[model samples]
Target: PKDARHDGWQTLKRFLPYLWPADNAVLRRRVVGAILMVLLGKATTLALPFAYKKAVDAMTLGGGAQPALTVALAFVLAYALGRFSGVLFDNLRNIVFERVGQDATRHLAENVFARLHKLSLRFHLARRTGEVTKVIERGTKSIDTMLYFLLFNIAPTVIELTAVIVIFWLNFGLGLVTATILAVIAYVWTTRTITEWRTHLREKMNRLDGQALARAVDSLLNYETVKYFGAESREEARYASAARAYADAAVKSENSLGLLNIAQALIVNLLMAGAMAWTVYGWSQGKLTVGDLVFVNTYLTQLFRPLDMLGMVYRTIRQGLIDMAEMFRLIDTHIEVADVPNAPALVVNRPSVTFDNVVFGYDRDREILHGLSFEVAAGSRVAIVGPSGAGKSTIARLLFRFYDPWEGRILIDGQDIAHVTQTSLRAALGIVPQDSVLFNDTIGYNIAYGRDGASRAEVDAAAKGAAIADFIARLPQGYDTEVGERGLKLSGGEKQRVAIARTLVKNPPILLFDEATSALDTRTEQDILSTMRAVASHRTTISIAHRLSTIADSDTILVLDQGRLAEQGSHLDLLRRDGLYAEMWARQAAESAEVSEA
Candidate 1:
């Protein structure tokens, strides 16, 4: 089942629609035009052997000076143009087909890109970036190369083979024709046999190479962790071992190519020798002329050249089919979450979130949220707080529909989110996640991301509201400064402020903050918490807080223990009860005391 892509027909069936889209008349016309060019190019090539034959005949004639000179000059012109004519039409085909390949590749890539975006958050969490990027890059680029070899190389060679066989049947004897036929069959068999075997080796090579790349990518991503553990040499040795394994696999893949080529060359040369021997014997018997010898020689040699290139064309096609099948499989991956047919938009007049007896897990073996039930009143600020593994983050994820509960209803504004359009559902709510990762773009652009086509004034206003306008002004580039990859150039507080600005740009009625200021130092946390309170002033807010002090002023605090609601009341109310909420508060208070004393 994992190797379903081994069927090349499946790959072709999926790829053909993208290559020749019915909706696009332009690509179809270009496809038609390029096919015509392939025929023209092949005609020029097939006629070259005939032109060469005539030139040899004309040279053999030892007639008078005028006859000799004129006849030889007439056919030499044929030979001259025919020799170079193939180049002209071949290049014309290439130029005509260039856009078709590029456009097809673009269309296919866009589909894959859109599919990846539509996939569940679990897909992103599980799949590695390096492998995803590797597949996209290889799969897209292979199409252009495959199109060239399929259209120009393989197609023209087949045409040349047909014409050469026709000439042999009409002129050369039947035995020579049979010899040519059997040898080519052998060549095809040998080529296909060896190539199929090599594909397995190549597959192994690709696997090893992917592992090497993944290890390198992951190691670099956790560069700081490696440093913290002082595992530099360990990382180096691990990568070295992976690279060594890949090199071994690669050497086998490359070496197998030599065997296929050798077998191909051996079969082709046998055909050549047999055909030439018969031609010479027929000439000695006066059944064939010297011109016939020349004709057979040139035709068979012309046929053998592309016949000799059999492995090259076939080799390219096998790899193309492999990459294509893998990419098609990627496109066919099951969408874990899908919208209902003609799902309507979610409308929020007064945003309220309710999780009714929800059950879910990243894996079925472990239920992270066990029949959890909670409700947030409209326009009220509710904070869910508890110790680690208490389904605090899980509640926020379910609220945003990153995943649906195995059993329960997540309702917003009295409408079940499962029945609503995901786009509209997300549009009604805004989230400022824990990490607040930013795109590597201008500061202004990052803020404007809250709304598409946002104006400069709106970006500036959101920046001012988030209390980052002064900091942006302090920078030499103002709002135009680029935050390096993942906003590494900015401090935790600055990135958090940017995240808040973007949410403000959308200005949704419902706001969810998942550990918003947990990464910031105390003073920075206080500043951002103050700013967050102001931002949450007119909106229904749900904060998943780790620190009790940050969300002490929330209208309601829900304490969760082992995915069940343990306590529900205001911060002071729960503290007075001396329940799970009180215990958590005392624990955090003691930790803070230890930190201050230390």
Candidate 2:
């Protein structure tokens, strides 16, 4: 609890910048207007009780007198109008400050969203999607409540309390004023102490609530896995256990509120009874008038109204601070990959890629590529082949600069890739991967994602180049057909072709195919292979192949073994040597023969 309070404020301090954006002058002006309205509203509310006191006094002293009636009527009108104005100003304050609160929320949410994208893939891989969304949701929702407390509840209460004390002193004497102030101090002290205890209970409940939600989300995300293993009962038991814990904590937290309310009511009502009795005794002794008695009651009742809400206000603000702190921790996460200062965009003349004695590994202790070197000549098709875990995929990732090599460097068209901006470097390259995932949108939207703002004609041409245009044209909705989640509605071969079409739309100078046709039938693979050859006529192509037949026509084939370049030459040249590449080719050919015979 102590740590939560400490870190909560620390996070809240960081949120201050967004609350009052320095450049938004119009919002600043509105903020000032809203604050002034709060002050005006409080003034009118305090004044209403004085008017009510005057009206009560006038009626009490009247004995069939016309002048008394007139005085009473005027005071009653003033009281009614004052109450109305107070309500009016407070509502107006909310209306004006609406923009400030919403704008602050928008900017904060936007910043957090952007930060998530900028964070490294490693961070995202380690984080749970459900938990991240929950944090952002709780944090953003808390902002408006926090703003309301600061501007309307807490600040206005302080002002009203001060005004009430001043009125008590001027009308009666220091004796009653001092007693009233002391009672207020005691009331506030009790509320604060009890509410702090309840805060711990509420915090526990909140933690359990988040845990339950995360568990449910995780179960749903792996829904297929659970069904496959016949684990419905097991998953339900786990989820129910989490939900029960949350329910227990919530019940405890809610029940404790009754205790707080009881203590608050006791302290406030005792003060009210004592103050009223004192005022009546003064009137009886002629030390104070009937007006004074009414004044005392009105003032204390008004002051106690907001005081009763103090418990709720304190809890809301404290919880808001904690939620904001959690979100800020995510924002403060370090970005493992960031562009260097004044980094220049990549320049491509011939798009020849070179890996100069590169050394890399997912982990430092187990190096995957050890001092490996290779080069793809400009406008030539080069294929990389190896057994599983022979650093085949690592080469593809390194070429895209998803990671930098531990030692040595990679170059594109004689320019060190490390010196170039990642955005620009990736812009010059395109890829069609083994598994292609698409958004749950129209087929046109998924294909057009490769080149932002691409026209229909351009998309059609790319689809034709990938040999998917005829298939798409046959659909009832054509390009407008919904692909469903991750394009699960489409066949594996269809999804792969869409990926190939997407890459073609980009028209990058360098192209990479990572088992691009592995999902297709033999006939379709051969057809797409012919299309790819036409596309590669003037473009540098790099194919990371598992099927030896697919890359047999490549100008050069590089074989990797145990994290080093084992062989490099034309396909025929390598086959004649009867080395690793030849052995792999023979094995795959025999497997294909068996499958065909079956």
Candidate 3:
């Protein structure tokens, strides 16, 4: 609740920018016109009751029959016209404001989408995809409803309330006006108090809903793992617990609504009964006319219609604020790896990379690379090999500038990567990771994702270079064949080949192959290795490998142990040294010999 109070106004202030966009003059004018139309509609609505009162009085009076009938008909016609005009103006208000609501939702949703991409990898890895999307969906959907209520319902209702009070004072006496105003205050107080309590219940229900959805999504995404473990019953139990919690909270929330409605009805009905009784008494005493009684009833009914909805309006607004606050919270998340102010794009003139006294760790207490330094000259191949937890993969991530080192700097082409924009830095390098993930789209689409708007011929050429074009052509649908979620439709070997083709399409100046051939069969591995060598012939290459054969042809091999550089040399040189690299190469060679003999 405290969070709701503080964040509510801040969320509204952020929303104001979308409401009155500076660049769209036409939208601004439309908003102004819509506000005027709201006022006009309320005026027409209020005028209708007065005309109806006049019509009733004309009919009630025993004047000349024809003259009375004519008078009553004139008032009746005016009343009907007023009702029509009120509806026309209100509908016009909605028509004029329609674009504003849509455009605001679009801009806000796009901004959130863009911000999610810019956020640090750590943030995304820790986030639940279902929950994140759910928040955005709720936030975007609420904008239109909130805007409509704020402009057309809440604001107009307040204006009408004030007008009705003034009308009671002018037509009747101060006593009736005072009594009416007291009833309004009591009604509003009761609604706000009860609705606030209900809001807490609704918040509980919403929290449970998100938790249940997140659990369901996580379970479904890990479908293979759950099936492998034969844990369908276990997963079902988890989901059912969450579902039951949500249902219980929802039941309580709905039942409380009945209590709020009963209280609201009691307040409004008592006011209506008391006000009508007073008017009737005045008419009986010859102080007020019969027409005055009708006028009081009509005014009260008109005012109460919107007032009866006040509880719902307040609850909706409060809930909407909460939803909006959750979304803005994501936008407010600080970018952990933001580019420096006025940073320049990375310029890859020679593509020579150097790590100077580099020291870094995901967490400060457990350092992974400690004062480790290396250099790769332009157009040369360097291989990194190490046992698990030796920080082999971390170096590649640092080079891409997914993170900045804590103590030292990494440079490319005499430029510190920390001072460059991430987009340009990543654009200069291409990677074929051990686990290659792809979008669920056509084969051509995944390949062409390497470069935006690539031609069919270019995609075909890249696929041919990766030796995957023939396989794609063999498919019934050719390049248009669908790759299922994360490219699960393809075998490990095929997916790896597609990844190679994608990287070939990118054709960056620098290349990294992180266990790039691990998934390929023996013959495919050898063939892809040949293609990789050809591709790296002109580009600077870094290979992080588990299989010694993959990096045997590399110009230099650097072996890491723990977090330090343990050995560095060519294959033959490392073998001569009889050290960790030599021992690993010997073991792998024996394993290969055993496989060949079998």
Candidate 4:
């Protein structure tokens, strides 16, 4: 993990060129405008210091005319105006670059989201949701602040410091300029040297702080778990432990920074005293005026402000680099299931599926589908029945090309599924998985999501096809009723109806129903099965389930035992043979009867 900094640096280098984006002219134009704004803003900023000198010099301070009062008033007001413009131009800089920075981050974030969807089902199942989300959140958030500090704070600070030394060189000669230069170098070096030491302390504090936050949130997020265990005090103790560590580290970190500031103060004051003493001696000799003293003081003030922020600016930028690198690693994750370049769309004349000796495993140690072979003639309702882990749903995943087998190929209308673009493959096939998950949107929106640019008439027809038209129409909201999270607002049967309608609107040549009615009660199961069967007309349907009663009506039943196809025949034929399907049928019938009796 410590060596990961090398990778972070490479990622940082990779990220930097986005300032003047290659493809976007508007963002690049904003970059150009922001750069000019920084120049103008700092230009006005340094102007005020010089104006203070002129204002001081304009005052007579001796005898009675009061003309010097007018002169002092005029230059002092110019100084005030210069300061105001500095604020104006700096604000303008932020306004201009606001879109430029965030737009780039948005584009990158969108790309990561799209890439995540493109990855294989295995990746989706394996990855931690919070990890990916946190990395992306941290990454994009820091870029905006880091961009401002680096460009608007650090770079412009150097420019201001250069101007200050140049003024010293011109006005007070080389000696004062040397003294000023030496003081700046020592101050910056001290800040850098000591802040580097304290950076670890601050980093430790942040880690402890995050641990405290994570502990509290995890405990709160699992309120049910806490209640079950009755471990409220235990959770509080864990959080307090982390919080205490953070508090102590924070104290140490803050104290060290205070130490850094005092050392910086000592160095600057020494320079001030020596420079003023020389000027005072020269003034006594009639070489320089009180105005030169005030000029030096004003210029020093200009340099001090930005230097004070340097510690924070340095740390923020460092943290930002690490955050962005974490995001890049996710962006750079290898896609396990990428379509071939220029792959043609699958053409579906027959839509018949042929799984020829296919073998697949999520992990290499254990095979899920052991040379599973099956054939579904065009427009036939094929049922694959098996015990749990007997590879029934694996068939559906394979048919959708979510995973390619280790051994053989899958054919769609005699064309190899792997050769076709995945988009076209999925476009030709639709699925109603075990759980009917829905977007938290209106019923009409869910139906329309089946196909982009689907007409209102098409959506209406599909709603009727799923037999959900009357249910939706009875409500005052009609099709506009919100489903809430994962369609939880609706019951099991209604959510399944919406899912069926969604697939119906797609109108794919092939369909997959993986234990479609598994979660519903018997009455709703019957309703859903009939609705599903009606929707299967003229479409090659693959029904996967553990319940033999569901598959008894299918045109052909393929009984899987372990990972292999153990039996294949009609419902009565398999029963007469007294095979695996027959035993499963009897067991399920007895279980359902027992359920009704209870």
Residue 531 displacement (Å), model 3: 3.3
* Most lDDT-accurate candidate: 3
How do the candidates rank by TM-score, highest first?
Answer: 1, 3, 4, 2
Q: Which lDDT tens digits does candidate 3 get at residues 1-598?
A: 2246566677888888887999899889988988899989999999998898889898878465768888899999999999899999999999998998888768877887798888877663666667768865776666656667777888888899889888888888677888888888998999999999988998999999989998999999999999999999999999999999999999999998998889878887888888889899999998887888888888888888877778778877777877777767778788879899999999999999888888888877989988778888898899999877678879888988878898889999999999999889998889999878778799999999899878899899999988889999899999998896644398777888788889888989899998888766788678778878877868999999899888899999889887678899899999899999988888889999999999
Model 1 weakest 10-residue run by lDDT: 1-10
Residues 1-598 of candidate 2 have per-residue lDDT tens digits of 2245556456666766776789899998888899899889998998888898878888877766768898999999999999999999999999999988888878877877799888766553656666868865676667668667866887788898888788887877667788888888888898889889888998899999989998899999999999999998998999999999999999999888988888888877788788888989988998887887777888888888877878878777777776666667668788766778899999998799999999999778889998889999989899999987679888777888878889999999998888889999998899988778788898888888889888898889888887788989999999998896544388766787788788888999999988878777788778778877877767899998889889999899989988779999998999999999999989999999999899
lDDT score, residue 548, model 2?
88
The regions of model 2 sitting more than 4 angstroms off are 1-13, 62-66, 125-135, 165-251, 281-287, 307-312, 330-332, 363-366, 486-488, 515-531, 576-579, 582-598
Error of 2 at 252 (Å): 3.5
Name the 10 consecutive residues with the lowest summed lDDT in model 2: 1-10
Which runs of model 3 end up more than 4 angstroms from their true locations? Answer: 1-7, 64-66, 126-132, 199-252, 486-488, 518-527, 583-598
lDDT score for candidate 4 against the true structure: 0.83
CA-lDDT, candidates in order: 0.84, 0.84, 0.86, 0.83
Provide the lowest-lDDT 10-residue window in model 4.
Answer: 1-10
Best by TM-score: 1
